[PDB]
């Protein structure tokens, strides 16, 4: 629908390990969602097979 | 708009390893 | 019986979810890009870029 999802982005976080020398890097992004819509607001059909 | 200033100060922490070891 | 106009007052919670990928880097690629591997020659440049 036309607006079916809220939806929040957080900020971006990087962290590493220096595991035999080298750095191995982890980005994470925390991010959360609600529906936002009384009543249903998609659905599907399931056409082919 | 995400990338190396803390990605920066992330890698090249890098050129510091005495913190010397005298007294 | 005549019914009076109903009201209600409904919330709905958030939920959160998250994302994550890494990379890593080699142990000598670390030392040619800080500097601590370079040396002042013709070659070491190669390697570096």
Redesign the interface.
């Known amino acids: 629908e036309k607006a079916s999802e809220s939806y929040f982005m957080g900020q971006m976080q990087v962290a590493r390990t220096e595991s035999g020398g080298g750095l191995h890097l982890q980005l994470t992004q925390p991010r959360a969602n609600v529906d936002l819509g009384v009543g249903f607001t998609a659905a599907y059909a399931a056409a082919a097979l | 708009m995400s990338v190396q200033i803390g990605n920066g100060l992330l890698m090249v922490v890098a050129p510091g390893t005495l913190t010397v070891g005298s007294a | 019986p005549a019914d009076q106009p109903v009201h209600n007052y409904?919330i709905?919670?958030?939920?959160?979810?998250?994302?994550?990928?890494?990379?890593?880097?080699?142990?000598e690629?670390?030392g040619l890009?800080?500097?601590?591997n370079l040396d002042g020659t013709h070659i070491s440049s190669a390697m570096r870029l």
């Open positions: 409904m709905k919670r958030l939920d959160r979810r998250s994302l994550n990928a890494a990379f890593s880097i080699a142990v690629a670390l890009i800080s500097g601590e």
